[PDB]
Each structure stands twice: as C-alpha cells, then as structure tokens.
C-alpha cells in the first residue's frame, strides 16, 4: 500500500535563502556542515535537476551504509523539491520506495516553515515501523539545523 | 579582440569516472579535497545544468577575492563541459569574460586526457598577460591532482 507521513519544522531563516543552501546546495553542504549525519554525497547521474541521480553516504556508526536518491523535481519558482529514495537504506524486503516533497514558505514574521511529506509504498498490507518515520524527520532537522547554523556564522553566504 | 589559449593534460583516471567526479561533482569536491585553492563553492542560480550560476570563493591569500562563473553547456554523452567566467577575479577593465572549454578524451592505456580552451574577451586591442593564462593551467592542474590523488584513495568513490 501507500502510506503519507507528514511534517512541518520551524527556521529563522528567510524562504530564498533557505531554499538555495539547504535545497539547491544541501549535496555540497551536508557533508560540511553535518558530518555525524553525512558523510559524502556523490553525484551518479545528471547536473542536479530532475532525473539527477545521487549516493549519500553515512559515516561509519550510522545504522545504513548508503541510500540512493532521484530528484524528481526542482521548482525554484514555489520552493519546492521532490526526490525518491530508491535504493539502499530502508529499501528491500517489504519497502520499494520513499517519495519526499518538501516546499518551504516564508512566514509573517520574516522566518519559513518547511511542509515535509514522507509517501512509502510497501508491500501489499504492510506497514512501516514509527522508528523508520521517527528517523527520517530526525535526519531532516539535524540537517536543516546545522546548515541554519552555518548560514547565521556566515551573514555574507547564499546572500 | 578575442584570444584563445590551448592546453592538454594528462590522467590517471578513465575518462566515465574523471568526467563524473571532476566536472559533475566538481563543485562540492573542489573545497574539500584542494582548500588551499578552492575555499568554497556557492550555487547562486539554477540546479547544475546550463543558465547556473556559481559563486567560487579563494582562500584569504590568493589574488583574487571570488569569482562568478556561468555553466554554458554539460554534454554527457560527449563528457564535454563549457562555462564562462563573467564577473569577479580578472573581469574588469579590459576584460569583459572567459569562455572555457574542457573535453575529456579516453587513450588507448584506459587513461584520460583533457583538452582544455580558455577564450578571452578583451577590449578592442588590449591583451591578457601571460600570468594570467599561466595562473588558470596551474589552477587547473592542482585541482584535477587533487581529484585525482582523492580517487586513488577512495577506490569506491564514482565507481
């Protein structure tokens, strides 16, 4: 079946920015900002765009060695990216495939939120453990955090 | 007028795989793997595909502060890349862009070679100087070394 597992998180920093280190730059980024959580991030196929192909890497005591990724699409106009989980991790056995979209939009207050949407497709009635969802929104926090951490030490970057 | 300057290199490295790591993944290498001559690397516009815009920052002692270079085209299936460098740097005064042109070449050992083409926009009569073409093969070298010492290490990394 499919299963939807939707989030929001919080930032300080303005959608654009946002939008152009953590989204269109996250690949260069992670590995930098966030090494306890990326190791490496190697480009298998494509510029970047949709149909690009990607290995992220986890360091050595991270519980999966590899995942391979497929952006789906990048639409820098509405700030929003979809890309696939396709291989490695998670992937096997009962599980085929991850479809994330996130889109970030700009608060009143100057800040953004990122609307996350986590779509699996298992087999038949099989369902997905709260861990496995609990870990994904784990990841994407310690993420954006670092690479908001990174953005407000360095006023002049993605600026 | 319009001046071009011509240079060949030798690789190690089969031409799929240079083409991938050096090109395709240049951006997020360079920084790491030759710091003392790449210190970062921002994407001001696009995905990575032709119409990006990159901003590269050198390190505190080199020459030149950044500079902004624009992906003109990425053909893959003739591992041929070509970008220009449209402001910062050496823009200015009599120079108004570089247009460069790297194609990878496979040789018959299962190395590489990459023929490089620097084309010079200058105002009317006014020539570039030699440094200055000297100072983009040496830029050049170091950094295609540095990628190339990084493969050797890491048999599994674009393989």
Excluded: C, W
């Excluded at 269109?24 to 959580?37: E, H, R, S, T």
């Excluded at 190791?39 to 992220?56: F, L």
């Excluded at 991270?62 to 979809?82: C, G, I, M, Q, S």
């Amino acid at each position: 079946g499919v299963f939807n597992y939707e989030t929001e998180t919080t930032s300080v920093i303005p959608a654009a920015r946002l939008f152009k280190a953590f989204i269109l730059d996250g690949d260069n980024l992670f590995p930098k900002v966030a090494p306890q959580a990326i190791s490496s991030v190697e480009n298998i196929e494509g510029n970047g765009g949709p149909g690009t192909i990607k290995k992220i890497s986890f360091p050595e005591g991270l519980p999966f060695k590899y995942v391979k990724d497929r952006v789906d699409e990048v639409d820098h106009t509405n700030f929003k990216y979809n890309y696939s989980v396709i291989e490695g991790g998670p992937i096997g056995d009962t599980l085929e495939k991850i479809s994330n979209e996130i889109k970030i939009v700009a608060t009143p207050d100057g800040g953004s939120i990122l609307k996350i949407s986590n779509k699996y497709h298992t087999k038949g009635d099989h369902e997905v453990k709260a861990e496995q969802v609990k870990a994904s929104k784990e990841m994407g926090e310690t993420l954006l955090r670092a690479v908001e951490s990174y953005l407000l030490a360095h006023s002049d970057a993605y600026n």
